[PDB]
Amino acid sequence: ECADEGGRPQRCMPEFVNAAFNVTVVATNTCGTPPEEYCVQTVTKSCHLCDAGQQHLQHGAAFLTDYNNQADTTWWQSQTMLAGVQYPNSINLTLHLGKAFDITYVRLKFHTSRPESFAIYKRTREDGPWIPYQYYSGSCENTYSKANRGFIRTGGDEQQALCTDEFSDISPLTGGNVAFSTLEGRPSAYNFDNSPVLQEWVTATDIRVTLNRLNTFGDEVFNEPKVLKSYYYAISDFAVGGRCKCNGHASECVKNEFDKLMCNCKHNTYGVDCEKCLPFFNDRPWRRATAESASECLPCDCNGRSQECYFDPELYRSTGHGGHCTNCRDNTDGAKCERCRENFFRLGNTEACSPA
Amino acid sequence: ECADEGGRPQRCMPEFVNAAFNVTVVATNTCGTPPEEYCVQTVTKSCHLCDAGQQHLQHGAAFLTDYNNQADTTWWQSQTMLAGVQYPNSINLTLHLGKAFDITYVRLKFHTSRPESFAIYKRTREDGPWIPYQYYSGSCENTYSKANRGFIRTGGDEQQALCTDEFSDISPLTGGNVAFSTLEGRPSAYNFDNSPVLQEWVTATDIRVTLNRLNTFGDEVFNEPKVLKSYYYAISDFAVGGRCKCNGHASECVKNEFDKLMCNCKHNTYGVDCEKCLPFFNDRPWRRATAESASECLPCDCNGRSQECYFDPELYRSTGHGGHCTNCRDNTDGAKCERCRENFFRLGNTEACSPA
Numbered sequence: 001e002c003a004d005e006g007g008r009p010q011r012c013m014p015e016f017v018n019a020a021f022n023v024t025v026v027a028t029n030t031c032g033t034p035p036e037e038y039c040v041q042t043v044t045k046s047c048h049l050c051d052a053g054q055q056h057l058q059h060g061a062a063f064l065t066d067y068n069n070q071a072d073t074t075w076w077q078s079q080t081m082l083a084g085v086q087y088p089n090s091i092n093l094t095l096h097l098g099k100a101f102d103i104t105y106v107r108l109k110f111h112t113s114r115p116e117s118f119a120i121y122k123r124t125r126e127d128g129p130w131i132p133y134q135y136y137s138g139s140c141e142n143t144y145s146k147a148n149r150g151f152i153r154t155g156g157d158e159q160q161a162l163c164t165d166e167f168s169d170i171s172p173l174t175g176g177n178v179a180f181s182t183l184e185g186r187p188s189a190y191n192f193d194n195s196p197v198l199q200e201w202v203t204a205t206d207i208r209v210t211l212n213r214l215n216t217f218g219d220e221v222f223n224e225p226k227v228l229k230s231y232y233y234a235i236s237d238f239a240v241g242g243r244c245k246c247n248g249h250a251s252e253c254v255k256n257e258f259d260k261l262m263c264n265c266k267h268n269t270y271g272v273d274c275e276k277c278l279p280f281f282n283d284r285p286w287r288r289a290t291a292e293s294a295s296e297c298l299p300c301d302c303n304g305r306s307q308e309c310y311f312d313p314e315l316y317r318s319t320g321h322g323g324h325c326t327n328c329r330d331n332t333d334g335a336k337c338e339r340c341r342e343n344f345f346r347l348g349n350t351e352a353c354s355p356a
Numbered sequence: 357e358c359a360d361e362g363g364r365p366q367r368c369m370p371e372f373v374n375a376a377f378n379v380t381v382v383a384t385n386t387c388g389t390p391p392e393e394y395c396v397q398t399v400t401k402s403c404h405l406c407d408a409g410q411q412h413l414q415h416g417a418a419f420l421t422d423y424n425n426q427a428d429t430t431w432w433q434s435q436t437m438l439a440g441v442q443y444p445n446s447i448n449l450t451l452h453l454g455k456a457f458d459i460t461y462v463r464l465k466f467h468t469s470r471p472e473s474f475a476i477y478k479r480t481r482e483d484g485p486w487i488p489y490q491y492y493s494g495s496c497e498n499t500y501s502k503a504n505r506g507f508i509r510t511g512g513d514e515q516q517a518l519c520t521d522e523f524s525d526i527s528p529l530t531g532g533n534v535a536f537s538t539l540e541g542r543p544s545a546y547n548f549d550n551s552p553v554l555q556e557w558v559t560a561t562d563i564r565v566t567l568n569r570l571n572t573f574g575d576e577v578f579n580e581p582k583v584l585k586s587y588y589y590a591i592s593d594f595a596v597g598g599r600c601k602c603n604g605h606a607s608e609c610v611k612n613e614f615d616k617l618m619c620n621c622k623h624n625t626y627g628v629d630c631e632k633c634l635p636f637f638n639d640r641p642w643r644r645a646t647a648e649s650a651s652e653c654l655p656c657d658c659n660g661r662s663q664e665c666y667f668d669p670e671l672y673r674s675t676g677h678g679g680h681c682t683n684c685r686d687n688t689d690g691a692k693c694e695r696c697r698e699n700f701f702r703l704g705n706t707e708a709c710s711p712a
């Protein structure tokens with residue numbers, strides 16, 4: 001896993017996944033309460049019923065992160081225009097990953113016409129604020145006060161959210177697929193392994209999609225009931241691929257005693273994301289492991305006297321190592337318990353440095 | 357001391373000394389009890405008195421290891437022939453060093469005519485038997501059933517005691533000096549640093565000199581009282597040079613709490629003679645430090661979990677190191693506490709490997 005043939009240490013990481021699967025997404029809007037009528041879009045119009053009570057017509061948020069059977073799908077649906085959605089009213093889908101992940105992409109399978117405008121936000125820590133990841137809209141400048149298909153200029157801020165209309169046309173009344181790719185278009189993505197900026201940009205504990213506006217044909221110009229019952233959001237699969245974040249100090253994440261997902265921190269690191277050196281392993285500062293060298297926390301010396309030490313920066317600057325031992329057993333002094341305390345000596349058979 | 361410029365470890369040893377100085381030698385015979393009369397040898401004969409009570413005529417064993425003032429001396433004296441000494445009766449002088457030394461030489465300053473025959477024995481450990489170091493006699497074969505001036509043949513037993521008459525002639529009625537040199541004449545003395553045989557041959561906790569026979573002029577052929585009172589043993593200084601044994605793992609010996617002399621064991625060794633690895637430092641076997649490489653006990657790993665380990669030979673054979681850790685704290689397993697016990701993992705913030 002996190003070590004080579006000879007057994008030397010080396011950078012690792014869990015395998016790529018879709019952190020969404022199983023995760024019960026939360027949506028603000030969900031047709032079915034109370035029962036209402038929707039009508040697929042085309043003439044003709046084969047209308048049906050969104051009903052929460054019956055298991056054959058339910059369309060909860062749940063149908064977003066369940067298995068994807070290309071044969072017959074499962075989707076979540078919004079109340080129809082008639083219920084008062086369209087715009088400015090919006091609908092939200094929040095994916096709670098419960099643990100920081102290194103996100104690569106967020107792809108959506110729309111069971112109806114993709115939205116006219118929608119954005120996709122993320123938090124880097126369950127504390128932190130909702131950050132704009134990407135904006136999709138046929139009216140970027142007007143809807144998101146943002147350029148049509150802006151590109152990130154070199155040198156410029158690698159973390160701004162862009163906007164495009166490329167995915168907002170209605171064209172495919174169904175199967176409308178949308179895919180967000182974090183490092184896509186970031187002038188540094190090549191040097192990613194040494195771009196803290198991007199290394200954080202891909203970081204994410206939670207992801208959110210905001211349906212801001214429905215794409216429309218024009219029929220709803222005159223409040224015809226039968227037409228409104230024809231426009232709504234419907235998603236057949238919410239998939240976000242990336243891999244559990246561990247900084248290259250683990251190759252597998254696992255739920256613990258408290259049922260919260262975490263990293264199996266190798267390289268002598270610990271912490272939820274293996275972002276820190278286990279105490280005692282403070283010979284040098286903690287680092288993300290690269291391909292070049294798989295940074296790993298090195299142990300203190302102490303010579304067995306102390307089982308505890310802190311990281312002394314000055315010591316580190318002077319000598320190569322900076323692991324400073326604390327409270328050395330057997331009246332043995334020194335930065336790494338390597339000497340007898342003044343006026344004490346090592347005298348035969350007795351294990352501890354004894355007085356004069 | 358026991359480390360070079362850069363501070364790397366290196367072979368050391370206390371400084372050369374005369375382990376005899378101050379040490380109260382013990383002699384079986386000592387004129388003065390009761391008062392008797394001795395007469396220096398030449399005619400004339402200026403006789404005097406050996407008396408225990410008066411401090412101006414006492415000649416205790418003590419005058420053997422006291423400072424040597426070339427101006428006026430101090431010596432220990434035996435009862436005169438008349439008291440019944442000569443031969444076969446012998447007299448003994450036992451130097452108790454109280455701590456194993458690496459002996460180079462034993463030299464004697466005789467205040468009278470050196471003995472006709474005497475040997476010098478040593479023990480390598482206060483337990484062990486009295487071993488013959490050297491034999492001096494004008495009649496080697498007859499007195500010590502040993503060759504006149506035998507030499508050690510190459511390949512042969514490097515530890516046998518030789519004999520010579522070279523120092524038993526009476527010639528100098530006084531100032532007769534005799535010097536024993538351990539490595540002298542030993543075909544291996546050149547390669548000494550890699551000759552356990554010789555390395556032990558020079559080892560010695562105690563030294564003993566045996567006065568077997570007095571050299572005589574012939575006058576005592578007829579029991580004349582005045583002549584017998586003229587023959588006796590008298591030594592002006594007993595000096596044994598060498599250095600406190602520590603195997604090159606110390607550069608100074610010091611008396612401890614119990615007032616018994618010992619080594620200040622560096623190189624991570626301990627024991628009275630630094631002949632063994634402090635527990636925990638069992639990555640490899642203990643060794644005497646040579647000039648080539650200053651063998652030093654290397655520490656076990658354990659990764660801070662255990663503060664105790666034993667030396668596993670098999671481990672040592674398989675991998676370079678063989679320090680095997682015992683009872684690893686924090687349910688952490690492995691030869692050097694480098695892994696979570698089966699069905700246990702390293703999960704964030706918690707220091708110990710916790711269950712599934």
Ligand SMILES: *[C@@H]1O[C@H](CO)[C@@H](O[C@@H]2O[C@H](CO)[C@@H](O[C@@H]3O[C@H](CO)[C@@H](O)[C@H](O)[C@@H]3O)[C@H](O)[C@H]2NC(C)=O)[C@H](O)[C@H]1NC(C)=O
Nearest residue numbers: 028090091092093094119121129130131132208209210211
């Ligand atoms: C659906 O997702 C969007 C995106 O986060 C949520 O909208 C956000 O809602 C909060 C509170 O309603 C807004 O915060 C407010 O910000 C303004 C100015 O920044 C400030 O004056 C307020 O004190 C407050 O902090 C946030 O701006 C807003 N984001 C955007 C761009 O609309 C929305 O709440 C989610 N669905 C829900 C729960 O309705």
Ligand SMILES: *[C@@H]1O[C@H](CO)[C@@H](O[C@@H]2O[C@H](CO)[C@@H](O[C@@H]3O[C@H](CO)[C@@H](O)[C@H](O)[C@@H]3O)[C@H](O)[C@H]2NC(C)=O)[C@H](O)[C@H]1NC(C)=O
Nearest residue numbers: 384446447448449450475477485486487488564565566567
């Ligand atoms: C002065 O130094 C000499 C040298 O050690 C002492 O002589 C040794 O004395 C012991 C006991 O008197 C002898 O041990 C005996 O050995 C024989 C055979 O090896 C054995 O039959 C006995 O059971 C016992 O073990 C030892 O041989 C002898 N050494 C020699 C070569 O004479 C002497 O005792 C010292 N001065 C004293 C205390 O009289």
Ligand SMILES: *[C@@H]1O[C@H](CO)[C@@H](O)[C@H](O)[C@H]1NC(C)=O
Nearest residue numbers: 020021022023024065066067
């Ligand atoms: C959701 O969680 C349950 C229980 O942990 C699990 O059995 C189920 O497979 C999960 N659903 C998905 C989409 O994997």
Ligand SMILES: *[C@@H]1O[C@H](CO)[C@@H](O)[C@H](O)[C@H]1NC(C)=O
Nearest residue numbers: 376377378379380421422423
């Ligand atoms: C003998 O021991 C005493 C007390 O330790 C010391 O003062 C004295 O100098 C010693 N004698 C010699 C010969 O050094």
Ligand SMILES: [Ca+2]
Nearest residue numbers: 063074236237
């Ligand atoms: Ca689905």
Ligand SMILES: [Ca+2]
Nearest residue numbers: 419430592593
């Ligand atoms: Ca003297």
